């Protein structure tokens, strides 16, 4: 069975401004099969109550999902997305970089 | 609107 590993982008809904409420996004896509585990991290700890979009897929049949949570960025707090999938030997972590 | 059901039974793959 051919499998496809997820691509992962971590970013903000709006341009980031310290002290201003916003949304932190983790977009996983290009993956198959559809089972996937996504966590949003704040200073290494799992954020509770993260929401996600309904499962859908692209023209090449790969799946995509947006995971999101309200957050207020500051200069020191660190954020990231942690993803596991059958194609990964261990969780992959991508750090939020406000310039990416 | 999605594809409606046929009068008969839905044809499986």
């Amino acid at each position: 069975m051919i499998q496809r590993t997820p691509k992962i982008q971590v970013y903000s809904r709006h341009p980031a401004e310290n002290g201003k409420s916003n949304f932190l996004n983790c977009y996983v896509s290009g993956f198959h099969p559809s089972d996937i585990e996504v966590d949003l991290l704040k200073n290494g700890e799992r954020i509770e109550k993260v929401e996600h979009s309904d499962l859908s897929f692209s023209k090449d049949w790969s799946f995509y999902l947006l995971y999101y949570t309200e957050f207020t960025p500051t200069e020191k707090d660190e954020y990231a997305c942690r993803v596991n999938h059958v194609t990964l030997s261990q969780p992959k972590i991508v750090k939020w970089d406000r310039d990416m | 609107l999605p594809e409606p059901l046929p009068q008969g039974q839905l044809t499986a793959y």
């Binding site: 069975m1 051919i2 499998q3 496809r4 691509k7 982008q9 970013y11 809904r13 709006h14 341009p15 949304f23 996004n25 977009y27 896509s29 290009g30 198959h32 099969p33 559809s34 979009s53 309904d54 499962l55 859908s56 897929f57 023209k59 049949w61 790969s62 947006l66 999101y68 310039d99 990416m100 | 609107l1 999605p2 594809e3 409606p4 059901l5 046929p6 839905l10 044809t11 499986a12 793959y13």
Partner: protein
Amino acid sequence: GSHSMRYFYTAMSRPGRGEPRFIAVGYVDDTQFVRFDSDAASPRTEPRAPWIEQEGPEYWDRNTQIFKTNTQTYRESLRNLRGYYNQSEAGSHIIQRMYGCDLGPDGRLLRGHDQSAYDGKDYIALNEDLSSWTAADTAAQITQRKWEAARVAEARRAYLEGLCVEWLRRYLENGKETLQRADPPKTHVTHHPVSDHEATLRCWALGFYPAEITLTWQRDGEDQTQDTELVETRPAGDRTFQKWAAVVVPSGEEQRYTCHVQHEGLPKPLTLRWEP
């Protein structure tokens, strides 16, 4: 502009963990507007965009019956396909279907689509004529014979040319303030050194709808496809999308580089440079 409607079905087996899950989502262009999930506490068709809420109970019950009946048939289909590939009852498998209609800018049917995949590979597809099938392998040929015997293509055609177009037009009207509004990208160029002699130029497009967009870098007017880093267009969560393209340039040569942006929401394609 042009517009399309698409439903996306996913049926997924999970031996030992109950019956296969069936989900259906509907879209107009890049806007989801309905969902159905057989795993919901009380499975029923739910609205996912404001303009669809005005539909009455008859609409929702009609959708729900369609999706519930499909839930049962897709479980049969999964059984059938496991057998077509001589697969064990232990593994989990997925059938996907995407189908719908495309309208041109005048609102007339451009073409229809009805495609299916098994475990992420092309399985069977309705040809553009809406009358014949293309099967990817000898298993899909079994499905093809069964669908030919049952005059399935005729039914798909009637739907694609009829109700699909009729309802898409209805939604486009009911949601005209959004569905028929293209929001242009807000754009800018950033600059950050990667070393003494090199710097990154990144061209940003933010806040655009629909997702279709073209973003390129040129050096002295020549395309820089190979040297451009291009991320996948990504959803912001407010309906809009984002994308960037980056290129690494010799310090001092920045003005030889131009970023070009094409989007439906733009009257004329944009050209941008870094502005120190």
